[PDB]
Design a binder for this molecule. Structure first.
Ligand SMILES: C[C@H](c1nc2c(cnn2C2CCCC2)c(=O)[nH]1)N1CC(c2ncccn2)C1
Ligand SMILES: [Mg+2]
Ligand SMILES: [Zn+2]
Length: 328
């Protein structure tokens, strides 16, 4: 509709609009444009307003978070943009602003954005088995996540990046604590435990009970973190090739170094379709199914796509198997 042309990092009104939905094409955007989006989220959600974030600091902070992600095939800045943007979608799709405080929203967002800071592209199993410095340092306890978290607060400690610089120390402490819980919650080692906790509370969920809410926030950050297959098929599908890229880098290394190899990461045994059929069926669907009990609109917007994806990979699998049978 626009009478002249703008720079990319001036998001158009349509981009700003699209950004509220999970249909958003995360791939269309370069890092600056992504950084502008994350910026707008913080303003749009009323977090700049309500926590007096100096708006140039918001930017420096974002820029600096971005510098601290690595160029991993999957665990990179675009990943965090996805996780952050899915949280944003969900604040709208589940009207989280009715249920949550702005302090909770600020934690969900800053945790989302930071939750994979300085990821090395090899998981906790590698760290632990290779007895890496991180694994030694964190006593084999959620080493990566504890690391992301530390880098998170090291950035915020720099005064030019400190988006919380104008929050009272009580609020800071409250934000810090949420952020830590949430970022450690993203360790998939704890998935069944966290899911069981949540389901127990879900027997009689209570929005005024802090414990209930911490479990809900943990499920929300977990949803956004592994949510790629909720996105449109053209947007989701390239991620899987990236994740397999990293997964294979590790299992090569693991073979060469004489360490155990996850069959789910073993080049020789994972294929895409088999990888995702199981993840969608037994991790993603069930998780969003229980979310839907609190937020029924989540079914239409996020279970449906997951069903379609499950069903397509089932189709693709039927065809791989035929063909891999002609390799023999
Ligand atoms: C490829 C598939 C996968 N993992 C994903 C996706 C998104 N996040 N993640 C993970 C979560 C933690 C970091 C990456 C995704 O879409 N697919 N992995 C295979 C693994 C598996 N383990 C055991 C059995 C079967 N399958 C699930
Ligand atoms: Mg992680
Ligand atoms: Zn992640």
């Amino acid at each position: 509709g626009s009478h002249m042309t703008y720079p990319k990092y001036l998001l158009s009104p349509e981009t700003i609009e699209a950004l509220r939905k999970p249909t958003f094409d995360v791939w269309l955007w370069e890092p600056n444009e992504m950084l502008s989006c994350l910026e707008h989220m913080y303003h749009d959600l009323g977090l700049v307003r309500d926590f007096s974030i100096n708006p140039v600091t918001l930017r420096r902070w974002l820029f600096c978070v971005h510098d601290n992600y690595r160029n991993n095939p999957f665990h990179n800045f675009r990943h965090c943009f996805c996780v952050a943007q899915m949280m944003y979608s969900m604040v709208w799709l589940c009207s989280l602003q009715e249920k949550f405080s702005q302090t909770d929203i600020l934690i969900l967002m800053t945790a989302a954005i930071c939750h994979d800071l300085d990821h090395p592209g090899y998981n906790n199993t590698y760290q632990i088995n290779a007895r890496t410095e991180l694994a030694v340092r964190y006593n084999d306890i959620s080493p990566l996540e504890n690391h992301h978290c530390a880098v998170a607060f090291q950035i915020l400690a720099e005064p030019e990046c400190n988006i919380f610089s104008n929050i009272p120390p009580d609020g800071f402490k409250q934000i810090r604590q949420g952020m830590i819980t949430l970022i450690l919650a993203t360790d998939m080692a704890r998935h069944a435990e966290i899911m069981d906790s949540f389901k127990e509370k879900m027997e009689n969920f209570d929005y005024s009970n802090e414990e209930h809410m911490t479990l809900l926030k943990m499920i929300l950050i977990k949803c956004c973190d592994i949510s790629n297959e909720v996105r449109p098929m053209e947007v989701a599908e390239p991620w899987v090739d990236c994740l397999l890229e990293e997964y294979f880098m590790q299992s090569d290394r693991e073979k060469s170094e004489g360490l155990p190899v996850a069959p789910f990461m073993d080049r020789d045994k994972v294929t895409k379709a088999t990888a995702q059929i199981g993840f969608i069926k037994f991790v993603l669907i069930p998780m969003f199914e229980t979310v839907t009990k609190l937020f029924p609109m989540v079914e239409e917007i996020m279970l449906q796509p997951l069903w379609e994806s499950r069903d397509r990979y089932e189709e693709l699998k039927r065809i791989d198997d035929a063909m891999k049978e002609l390799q023999k």
